[PDB]
Design a protein around this ligand. Sequence first.
Ligand SMILES: [Cu+2]
Ligand SMILES: [Cu+2]
Ligand code: NA
Ligand code: NA
Ligand code: NA
Ligand code: NA
Lengths: 12, 12
Amino acid sequence: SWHWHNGKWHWH
Amino acid sequence: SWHWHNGKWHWH
Ligand SMILES: [Cu+2]
Ligand SMILES: [Cu+2]
Ligand code: NA
Ligand code: NA
Ligand code: NA
Ligand code: NA
């Protein structure tokens, strides 16, 4: 099924 | 550095 992925701040 | 990941619709 569909899965919403929230936006997020990703530390590189 | 910081990296903004947009939210998205992910098809499983
Ligand atoms: Cu997903
Ligand atoms: Cu990232
Ligand atoms: Na979802
Ligand atoms: Na995921
Ligand atoms: Na960015
Ligand atoms: Na990524």
